[PDB]
Amino acid sequence: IVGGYTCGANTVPYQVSLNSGYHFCGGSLINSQWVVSAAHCYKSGIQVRLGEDNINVVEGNEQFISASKSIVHPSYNSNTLNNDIMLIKLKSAASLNSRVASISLPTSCASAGTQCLISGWGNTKSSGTSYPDVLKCLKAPILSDSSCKSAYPGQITSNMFCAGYLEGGKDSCQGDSGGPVVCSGKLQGIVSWGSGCAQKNKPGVYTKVCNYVSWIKQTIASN
Ligand SMILES: [Ca+2]
């Protein structure tokens, strides 16, 4: 997160870190046994780390649980990043309390102008590299489909939305990928892509979760 703020320990209780020896992506806890993340975060050997603030210190609220199964969206295209979503099932159910909690799925899509909270352990510099230990947060609005397409001609599908600031300075970044965009208490986005970080006229691009709720629910129901 570039241009954000320190969230506060466990104030984002659905935020997870995907660990393969090191943090490599975020995710969102959507029930006691399932995490949603970005398909471009797929790899084998994932350990889901819940209840994290400092990802380099054991502070007392962590739950570390191995993935038992990963499911990349059937129609994920790694070239275009269309359908950049994946589900991860936990080998055991997480214990849910106020510091570790699932985030509600949307029943309807969000609109341009809604403010949302975006969070993660990604890079904090736009012309630099600095990775935080503690969870960073950014409040950002959803942008219009037309400004999204204008920023990124020929690249924005119906399964993507832009959020952030056209002026630059405030964005998600490398290492936030897979993490949440939460708007009015619903998971509306997944950190997916963008040209650089926090560049002018290059907002963040997010997977549009509301298009996937039927797939998410049926997948959970059969796995
Ligand atoms: Ca920790």
Which of 17, 23, 37, 40 is catalytic? The answer is 40
**Rounded distance between C-alpha atoms, residue 204 and residue 118, angstroms:** 10
The answer to whether residues 71 and 51 belong to one domain is yes
**Rounded distance between C-alpha atoms, residue 13 and residue 101, angstroms:** 5
For the chain, give percent helix, strand, coil, nearest 5: 10, 35, 55
**Rounded distance between C-alpha atoms, residue 90 and residue 28, angstroms:** 12
**Rounded distance between C-alpha atoms, residue 163 and residue 193, angstroms:** 11
Give catalytic status of residue 84 as yes or no: yes
The answer to whether residues 134 and 180 belong to one domain is yes
The answer to whether residues 44 and 94 belong to one domain is yes
The answer to whether residues 17 and 88 belong to one domain is yes
**Rounded distance between C-alpha atoms, residue 66 and residue 89, angstroms:** 9
The answer to whether residues 184 and 220 belong to one domain is no
Closest CA to 204 of 177, 171, 178, 176: 171
User: What CATH number does residue 142 fall under?
Assistant: 2.40.10.10
Give catalytic status of residue 23 as yes or no: no
Question: Looking at this protein, which amino acid is placed at residue 72?
Answer: V
Domain carrying residue 67: 13-102+211-223
Structural determination approach: X-ray
Resolution (A): 1.5
SS3 126: coil
Alpha carbon 222 to chain centroid distance?
A: 24
The answer to whether residues 120 and 135 belong to one domain is yes
**Rounded distance between C-alpha atoms, residue 194 and residue 174, angstroms:** 10
What's the 184 CA to ligand 1 centre distance in angstroms? 27
Provide the number of structural domains found in the chain.
Answer: 2
